[PDB]
Structure formats: structure tokens, C-alpha cells
A paper describes a structure:
Among all r‐BOX or RBO genes, thl_1583, which encodes β‐ketothiolase (MhTHL), is identified as the most critical enzyme for the carbon chain elongation mechanism in M. hexanoica. Therefore, MhTHL is compared with other well‐studied β‐ketothiolases (CkTHL from Clostridium kluyveri, ReBktB from Ralstonia eutropha (Cupriavidus necator), EcAtoB from E. coli, and CaTHL from C. acetobutylicum). In addition, we postulate that the properties of thiolases determine the carbon length of the end products and that the high n‐caproate production of M. hexanoica results from its native thiolase.
The THL from C. kluyveri (CkTHL) was selected as C. kluyveri serves as a model n‐caproate producer. The strain containing MhTHL produced more n‐caproate than the strains encoding other thiolase genes, reaching a final concentration of 1.25 g L−1. The overall structures were relatively identical, with alpha carbon RMS distances of 0.50, 0.62, 0.53, and 0.46, respectively. L87 and V351 in MhTHL and the corresponding L87 and V352 in CkTHL modulated the pocket size to a greater extent than the valine and isoleucine residues in EcAtoB and CaTHL. In the case of ReBktB, the protein contains Leu89 and Ile352 at the positions, making the pocket larger than CaTHL but smaller than CkTHL and MhTHL. This corresponds to the n‐caproate production results in the platform strain SK‐1 with altered thiolases.
Numbering used by the authors:
A (entry chain B), D (entry chain B): 1 to 204, 211 to 236, 240 to 393
B (entry chain A), C (entry chain A): 1 to 204, 212 to 393
Write the structure that this text describes.
Amino acid sequence: MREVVIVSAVRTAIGSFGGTLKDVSAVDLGAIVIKEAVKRAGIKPEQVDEVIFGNVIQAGVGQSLARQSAVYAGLPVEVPAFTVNKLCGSGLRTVSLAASLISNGDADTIVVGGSENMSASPYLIPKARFGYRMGEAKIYDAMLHDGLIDSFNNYHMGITAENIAEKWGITREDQDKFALASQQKAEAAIKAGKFKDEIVPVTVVVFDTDEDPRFGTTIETLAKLKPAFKTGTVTAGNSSGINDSSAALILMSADKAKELGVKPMAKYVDFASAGLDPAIMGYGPYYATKKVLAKTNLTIKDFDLIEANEAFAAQSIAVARDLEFDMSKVNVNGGAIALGHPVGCSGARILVTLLHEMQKRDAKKGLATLCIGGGQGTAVVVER
Amino acid sequence: MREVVIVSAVRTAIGSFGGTLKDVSAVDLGAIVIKEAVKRAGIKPEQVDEVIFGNVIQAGVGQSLARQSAVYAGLPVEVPAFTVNKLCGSGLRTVSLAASLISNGDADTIVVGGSENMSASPYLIPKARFGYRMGEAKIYDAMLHDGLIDSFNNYHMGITAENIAEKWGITREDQDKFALASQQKAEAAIKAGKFKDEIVPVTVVFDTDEDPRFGTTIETLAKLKPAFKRDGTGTVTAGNSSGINDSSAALILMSADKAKELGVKPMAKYVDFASAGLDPAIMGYGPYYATKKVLAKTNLTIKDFDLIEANEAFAAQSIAVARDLEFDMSKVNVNGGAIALGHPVGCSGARILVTLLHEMQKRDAKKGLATLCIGGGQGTAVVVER
Amino acid sequence: MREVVIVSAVRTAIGSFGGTLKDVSAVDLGAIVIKEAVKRAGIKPEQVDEVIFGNVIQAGVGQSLARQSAVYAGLPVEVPAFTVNKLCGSGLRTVSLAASLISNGDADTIVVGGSENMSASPYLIPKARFGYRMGEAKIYDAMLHDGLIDSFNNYHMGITAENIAEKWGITREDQDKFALASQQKAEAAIKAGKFKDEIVPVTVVFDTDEDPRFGTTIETLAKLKPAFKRDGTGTVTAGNSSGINDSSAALILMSADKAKELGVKPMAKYVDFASAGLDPAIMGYGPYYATKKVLAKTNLTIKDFDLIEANEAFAAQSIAVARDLEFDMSKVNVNGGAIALGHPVGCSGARILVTLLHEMQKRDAKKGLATLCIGGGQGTAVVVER
Amino acid sequence: MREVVIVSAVRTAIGSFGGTLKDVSAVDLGAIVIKEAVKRAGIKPEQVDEVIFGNVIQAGVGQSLARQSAVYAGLPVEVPAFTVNKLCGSGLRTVSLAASLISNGDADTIVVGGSENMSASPYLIPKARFGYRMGEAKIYDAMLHDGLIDSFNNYHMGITAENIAEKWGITREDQDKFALASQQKAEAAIKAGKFKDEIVPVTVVVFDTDEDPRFGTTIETLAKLKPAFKTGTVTAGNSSGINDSSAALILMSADKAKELGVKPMAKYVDFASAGLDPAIMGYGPYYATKKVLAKTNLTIKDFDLIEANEAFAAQSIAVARDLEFDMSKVNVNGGAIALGHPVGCSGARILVTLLHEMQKRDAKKGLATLCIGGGQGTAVVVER
């Protein structure tokens, strides 16, 4: 093995569904963050060995996004690239993969991250090729069909949250209280400038501020909302949204960062992925996190900051209780309920957020983890 | 770093465009080969640590194919999985990635491969969400738009074959002759039983590659019309291109340590890989750069390979590559290649490796190369050794 | 008021669903029959004063079919035209309308008829304009949505046939026996050359009705499964319903005065018409009301007709009608009906009239009735006389 | 022959494209005006003998609109109905047809008119049935494909106006001056309440006022606009719009109006239709009007009011010059440039407008005429 470091990390502000980044392609969002990450690391484009990038709703983006974003970022055509799809886990799995390839000597410098434009995703017509012959037929929303709908059970991932709420005893009030605190933390962090260092502006009008948060959210406001997916408890107010954004990081061997005089943001320690019953996919962080702790001989007390993606309050609460998070150190600047869940990006997005806040607080150790549609979880530990 | 071995390798026969596997989903084809791969390895399902699988035209297959296929194959829900898209390279990149992960200690046993159902791929309506407002618009073929059309130049990958025929001076006749040999070798290989070991039956009982055109003659090929250009300048035809096809393939890589512990007799040792980028406009030449690079990593030359699988996307790109890497053509695609057999994009990279390993065993061959060009301007390669 | 005569009558043979005319547009089929109708009348094109033509599934045919067909048929651009949509009734309503116009002095010579290409009809995307925003949606078959599904009940017109089989107590066996006779008579009529005079060839050389199922037996019909209900309650099948079909038909009506002036020998005199509405849920019974009404206008009874064409949309509705109007069945659909020949919706009403006039001439018959049921809950009828 | 009278006439306000009537089906608009026309004539529903109704973009309205609108209007199911498609001429051709049927003794009472919702029209996928096999394909806008595009020449009807502008020497300035006067007349008529008697409200918010007119239009505003269809001169400012609306009238034999004590609004005199070269379809009113004058032994001087549909300024100007209209008596309350052109309705719409203004002015004779896509024109003369 060899030591791996993270040398730069950047993200766009997160667009709302049908919002300010609705007409900026996933490809273009990826290009902006790849270019900017290279700039921030102070290396040459030619120094990148590979690009590994998340993208989940691939329908209609054209050939393999990673390759497109790399070239339009201005990396040489000589740089090879591939696209990862681990659903919600995509952006964060690019990180661990890269660290493994560098550790094993297969590369020195890899650009990682993820891009998703859920707004711009198309509809699908399954039998346009050989025809329907007779009778009405269904067109599908690619973002749901290839993303947010569990393919095994053919229900929304919202139902997986209700399953967890039921099975873990998580009340509507608890869910809404969790949501409120995400909105509160997010509004305070935005106005306090916490995200200024990590965000690259996009000109569409200069878009530089996360727009999904609902400032002034109250417990009463949340309480009014109707369950969105079914007896229900999971609403659009206590669930992440549908969003458009990208994020990029650069991993390097400690060897090559030294040679080039590149100052690392943090050390990559390790990762873990786990599968579990699709019907409770939201609990996957439990298994992932446990595994990475057994690999690293660590404990939850050893983390100064935790980014745990907030797909749904119900799943986040279940995770937090069973890993026994200290919630003072979780998602300190807000989480996905407020900020958004651009599926193929989020995993990298939360790592970008973690790293910059780790710097501001001079934290030692850090955990990023999130649930994955179809029944998975993945986690990464960093240290400074 | 640790040694990595290949313990099993299996594929479906390759369906034609709108042919016998047109209604078996990419997901189901993947399950079949993942299932059989595990069975052939003599391993329990719970032994698998991860599934890394290729799938290029992902429109309408549902959530990430790798996880769906792994679960429908009977692998425990505890096994994590993800889907790789390096276009035509996908299936072979799953192999090199898994090797790096096992070598780095991040796993002991990984299922890899790829599945593509090009026939079942949908059309797309880009502005159905917020509306077209007024006037005509276009719906797109997912297989072309997300696969076989170069997204930088917005022309078909067949034009890249044309760009290469122009710059390397590869005539229509040279292309047709390469295509005839590919058809001849596939016919003899099929009739000689060469594919019987590696193919797993699919009851729709489909067990024979159906895209080959038995009795192909040079005159046959000369009658066909340029498929991508017309206007006089064309040389690439349906007869000297790979087809559009539906198939899956799977392999199991394992640390040498874990193999020995379990008493699994490996098929072969994984040696190394390389990937390279180049000008998208001549993407077909990617094997050259990828092969030169893996050769340098392994300290081998082309003479060292008993058997070579170089994927036949287009005769025009395969000829440029063979010339510039100075292949001994008697050792290349000995059982026929994609012109004859087909090019199920996300599967092919794994497919050619299963074909290579089986021929290597038949021949007691010592060293093997699998390489292929990649839409967008890339190439990847893997060396194996027995 | 003035006398109106029919001077020419012609149809294409009837194409099957996805059959030989599937790629000849409704517009082109209309041009063919309008062309030949004029030629058969021995009239110059410039003699035509108006074209009134039927077309039901208008989605994607372009601007108003009547005008397109009239111009492509070589009629002067000066000839005005419009398209009638009374669903299944359309082609026959063009006839009665033109008669009223000529009788009222608003024209001397009118081309009438209908054209339907059901095979070539498109699908619809209702919210493509302003967008679906989120989630699954439906695309609709134009032929069902704008034709064969009752828009008030949103069930298929086949259910209306089921409603009638229930209320009139018409068994599956009665339906199958009516269907067998229709298949028998069409086979004999075709082989006897009965359709040779009225049919105009279309080179795609299509000149023979292709929907009939020669050698139909009662056992054949009994094997088929209910097409519209299932759940046990079904009796209406593909074998005892009309099909989905593609064809055109045209006729030329003229004042008796203008006919004599020009020396045009008429085929027949137009007598009168009636149209009626009823409960959409039993739309198939519309002929009863329409026929009772035209009988009252003309002071005739059913016994007075030598020949009857009652369109066979569904055996179930045709049996109810025949019973309640007390038809002499030996005089009905003597050359077979729509179960055998097909139901190209916007054409059929004209089609059955061309078939009637030709048989009337063969038989030197004196009086004739053409009637058919209409989706939405209507019926229309026309009496003619030689 | 027998005398025919018009006993009632009514229309909805005309919706803008994507405007207030975008989600009120053509069927429903037809039902509102049929019901209201019956009410205004003071007859029973059972007294209607037949419904003949215009509808041009039929794609996706379901089975034959005339029949649907009749039943949902509350006319007995016993009433027979059929739908006419003479493109732009549809609504007015229903009138003449009906008068012929009544004159000939085939009916006593016919409801006529037209309904078009252009907004709600769908897109078309030609080969969904037997499939596209491979490669991109086109979806079509039904309103253009089955309506506003000349099927012979495969160009917009806008090009037919440019053809006329070129061939008749009609300048951009002349076109824009014509447009301005339509807007001016329309704004004045609306604010003056001229349309209050003829409009039936629709609750969607009570919609009762034509919304397409652009109040405050200036010659300078028009002059700024860019040609819309090609050297060009025809803009969206000097062309009718795309619109949603319905209109209904009731024709009766003089015999039956007498029997029932129904007070007629006017006498139907006669009509004419004409075909001409599709490429100059806008000039069809010339031929139509000439023919109806030869039938009625009348002259343009004999009309106290003229409604000449304003498809395009260029065609309207050409028509007006060659028939030598006195433009003081044409479209006195504004025309389609301001008000809109709901294709299947317009022909009936202009007759509704004509009749009510004929009443207000106590005019004796009246002409309604309009051009028809695909190369036609149609005209009707009424008298009080």
C-alpha cells in the first residue's frame, strides 16, 4: 500500500428542481468543477492520470459523462476517464476507488467527484424501437425510473423511509424536528459564509448560493405538510429534494504531492461499502460505518465531524441512534433536507463540505457516509 | 500488492439486433452469467465481496444494473455492487479495477463483467419534463445518443472508422478482406465446438452465437453499400463493422491467497492493465496507446503473446491497430471477432477476455492480451498469464 | 328540391392491420379513389363542384384530408373541399350531405366518400407542449383514443358490443355463427369475382380484400378468446368483431338535370337518409333507429329492400339490429361484411354503399339500404333506388 | 327551398396561447357555448334536430367533438351530431351546411359553431406503432402539423402571407398599420362593452374578456418586431395568434321559429366557398366573396358591416384592396390580429361578432368571410 492524500475539493451551489441550473448540462457542471479543482490544486492538466466521476441518471447525457466533463474541463485528450454508478453512493465511491488505484501504484493523480442534473433528465419510451402495436402505453421519467424508484419493489425510495419509520418507531414529530434542525443549520451556515470557500460560481446571473433551503422554516410549517409517498409520515419537508449540482476532488499519492510541492488538505484513511435489504436501504450507513470502523480500529467518538447524507429524516434518525452519533458533530452546516440530493454528486458533495469545515475547525478525523437506493451504504474516513 | 487470479469465466451467446435475446433484459442476462460464474468457481455466493459490472446504455434499465443483476443471481443482499461505464471498454475495465482492489487488500473475491441489451434500449424525449412549447422536435435513440454517436463531434463512431481509413490509407477491399477472415474463423470455431465451454445456455434454448454470416464471400461484402457516409467517400459498411447486439459475460477474480485457502484452481493469473486517451475523432486507434503502455508496464513485446483478442469494432480501426502494433495475425481473434460475433457494448470487454482465457486453456498458451477501442477516444488493455 | 343520382362508385381493396396498404397514407388512398371515380363517371375534373370526404383518425394526416386528396387526385385547386367526422358513419354521411346540397341547388356535382389508414395512425403525447413535470405518464394510440374507445365511458366500443349481447341475450355461439356466415359469403363472393368491378388496383398490385379468413370453421371461432373483457363475462372476440383496416372509397353524386345534360348514365337514384342518436353504451343498435326513421321518411318497410348492407362492427350489434328490424338475412351483406372484409372507420360508410350499388346492378335490384352503427351512440342510413 | 333564420349566437372570450383556457378542453368549451346558445334561443334541448360543429386539431380530443360537446351540453342522446373540418373555414361552413339541410327539409333546428383549444393540442409520434428500428426521429406538434403548416408545400401559412406581400406589393409598414388599427379598434370595443352581449363567461376565476389584444400598441412597437417566418415582413405583431375558444349559433327554418314564437336575430341569405393556389391561400376571400355576390345579386356597397378574418395583415390587405372594401365597415370591433384565431372556431366566431354589431347598428346586410389553410375561402351573407 501507499499513502493517499486529498489536495483540492470544490462543488457548485446546489440547484433546485427546475431552478437556476436546470439548463446547465450535467456534463457542463462536471467540467466546471474538474477545471476548478485542478486550478485549486496548483497542478497542470497534463498531470492528471485519470478521471473517475459519478453520474446516475445517464439517460440522454450522451457518452460516459466522466470523459465528456474531463475534455471540456480542458484536461488533455490523453487522460482516460470512466463513469461510476453506485446510485446515491456514486460520488463518494469515486473517492475510495481512486485511493485504491493510487495506493496500488496504478496512478499518481486522479480527479474524482460527480455530477447530476435531475431537472434536465429526459422521459423514456421503452418500445419506440419495435413499436407498441396497439393500445396506450407508459412513458417513464428517467430520474424516477433509473434513480429514485426501487427497481426490486417498484416503489419510491420514500416508501423505504416509511418502512424504517414504522420498524424503528420514528414519529412524524421526530422526523420534522430533525428536518427543522437541518434547515436551521443550513440558513445559519449560508448567511455566515461557511460555504464561500468550497463553492465555485456558475454564470447562467452568477449562481453561487445554495437555493434549496427554505429560510424561516418552522415546526408548524413542517407539521402542515401532507405525507408525500403514502398512515404516512414522510413528507417533502422532511425528505431531501430533487436537485442539480456537481462536485470535484483531487486525490494524489503522498509521494507525488511531495515531489510537486502540493499542499494536501487531508489524508485518505479508508472506506467501506455494504449491502442490505433494499426495503430499508436508508439504514445502509449503519453497516458501512461499522465496517470502516473495524478496518480502521476507530470509534464514532474518534470523529470530530460527521457528514451523513440526509436522504430522509427517518433513515437519518435510525442511523444516528444505532451508530449513536453525537448530533452536535453531524452535518454541522446543514444536510440534504435543506441543501438537496443531486444523486450522482451528493456523495462527493458531502466530502467537499466535510473537508472545508474540518479545516475551519482544525478537526483531526472525519467521516462521510450515505445510504444508497437499491440497498447499500458507503463510507469514507479522512484525517488531517 | 498481491497476486490476483481469474477463477471462472462465462458468457451468453451473442444475440443479433432484434434477435433471440431482444426480450431478455440486460439485468436478467447479467444475473445469468453472475449465477453461472459463481457456480463454475465452486464458491458459495456469500464468498463474493463485491460485484463490479459494465453497462453502457443505462436508459430504462432501472437502478444501477450491477446491483440488480447481483441480487437476481442469488448473491446475498449484503454484497455491495456498482456499475462501470467506460463505453466499449466497460466490461474489461471492471476486470482491471477489481484486480487493483484485491491487490490493495480492499477485497478477496470480486465478480466482474458486463451486460448490454442494445435491442431493448429505449428512445428519449429530452423536454417532456418542462415541455417543447411549440414546433417539431427530435426524439433520440438511447443506443446511439448514449453509446455509438461521438458526443464531442456528434457523428457516429463509424465516421471515426472512416477518419482512420483515410489517414492510414485502408481501402474498402482491405476492410472487406479483414471482415471475411473474421467470418471464416467464427464459422469454423463455432462448428468446431470452440465456444461450447465458455457459453451458458439461455432458455427464451439459445446457446449459439447468431450474428455470424456463414458462407460470407468477398463478393458478398463488395455488394454492400457504405453504412455511414455515402457521398462517395464511404468504405465502412454493415459487413465490415461490428453489429448491434445483446449479451452478457462474467468472470471471478480472487487473490491467489484466497484461491489457495479455498482450494479453487484458477484459470489464469492477472498481470496488469493500461488505459489511454486520444483524439475522439480517431478513437479506434486507442488499442495502440493502451497496448504500448501495458507492454511497458509488464516489460513485454507483442511477440510474447500466444493469443490476442483485439475487439473488432470496425475493420478500418482493427487494421490500423494490427499494423501499428505489428500483430502476428494468426494469433489474433483466432475464433473470430466482433464483425462476425457482435459488439454488445458494455459486455464486449469482458466477452473477449472470456473467449481469450478459453482458447488459452485449449492451447495451453502462456500469455494473452485483451484490448479494445472506446467511443469518446480511449483504449484499454489487460494482460493475463497461465 | 331536385333529384340526385349516383353516377360512379369505386373502392380500394381493404388492407389488413399492418398489411399491404399500411404505408399508403390516408391522403394517397383518397386521391386514388377520387381520381378513378371521376374517370368512371366520364366527367372532366373541372366539372366537380365540391369534395366532401370522411376521415376519422385525423392525427398526423396533415391539413384536412378531403382537400389534400382532391388536389392529389388532379382535381383543380379551384374545387373547394371539407372533411367530415361522424366516426364510423363518416363516409355514408358525406353521401346524404352532398345530396342535400345538390337538391338545395348549392352544387350540381359532388365527389364523396372516405379514407382511413388505421395502421399508419400515430401515438399522442398530450403534455409534450407544457411538460409532465414529474412521474410516469401515458401516451395514447390515436386510433383508439380518437376512434374506437367511447369517449364518454372510456371503454372500448367492444364493451358496447358486450352490453348489447347481455341485454338482447346474444350468446357467444350466435355471434360465432353470424361471423362464420360473413366469412363464407366473402370467400365465395371474392372467388366468384363479385368485387372485380368496384375495386380499383393499388400498386404498392393490391386488388383483393386480404382481411377475410378463408376456411373459417365454427370450431376455429370457438377456440378464440374474448378480446375485450376476459373475467368470464366475454363473448366478443377478434373472430366475431370487425378488424382494424386501411382503405378508401369514393362516389360521385350529381343532379339528375346535370347528369342528363352531360349524358352521364347514372348507377342509381338517391332517395333519402336518416341519422339518429342513442345511449353511447349500446351504440351498436343505432341502425335500428336510423332505419326506422328513413323508412318513415320514404314510406317503405324492410320487405321493400332487395339488398341490404348493414355494417358488421360486431356480430353482437349486427344480430340485435337484424332481429329488431326483422331483416331477411338472405338479402343482407350478400357478399360478406366487415367481420370478414374489415372496418376502415372513416371509409366504411361509403365502402358499403359502393358494394351495395354493384350488387344491385348485378341483380337488377330495385331498392337498397345502407346503414351502420356509430361510436358515441349514433346510427345513419341511406336508401337508393334503380 | 325554404327560408332559414339565425335565432341565437354566442362565443367564449378568446384565450391566449398557454393562457386562461389552456386546461379547458375543446369539448368543454363547445359544451358551454351549445348549452348557452340553446338557453338564449328559448327552446328546449329536445327541439334540436342536429349538431354540426367545427374542430380542426382533432388529435387527442377523443371521438368526434361535435357529439361530445352536444351530450355534455345536455342535449338528449337522441340528437345526432358530426364534426366539420374545413380548416380555418370550419366554424362558418357549419352555418351554410345547416342552412342547406334546413332549406332542403332535412331538419328544422341545427346547432352550429366550432371549438378549438390549440394550447391543449398534443404532440405526435408517427411510428410509435411499428417502431423506428434505429436512429433519431421527429415528433410533431399537432397544431402545426395538422393545422398551421401547408401540407402541400410543407411551410407555415406565414409563408403564404409573405408570398402575397411579395406578389401584391404590400409593405411591412402597410401591414403594421393594418395591425395597429385592429389593436386600436379591439381595445376601444372591449372597454366600450361591445362584446358584453355576445360572450358567455367561463369559470376556470371568471374568464369573460378577450385576453390576446395588446393594449397600448404603437406603430413603433410593431416596427421593432422581427419577421417570424423567414427578406421578411410578416411578424407575430401583424399576424393572428394561436388561441383557444368556442362559438355557437342556432339556425332554424322560418316556419319553425314562427310555430315556436322564437324571435330571429337575422335571416341567412347564402354562402359560397372557393379553392385557389395553396401558396396564396390568404386571398381565398376574394373568390368566395365574388361568388356569393353573383349568387345574391349584391355588391360590397350593399353590406353595412363586414367581418373578414385577419389571418395575416398581408392577406387581409390584398383581399380588402381587390374587393375594394370600405374599411370603415370592416371588423369594426377589431379582428383576429388583436383578438386571436382559434382555428376551428374563428369562422363561427366572426359571425357571432358580426350579428351582435349588426343589431347594435340596425344594419340591413352583413358579410362574413375568411381564408382557409390549404387554399380555400368561404363566405356567408346575412340580413336583418
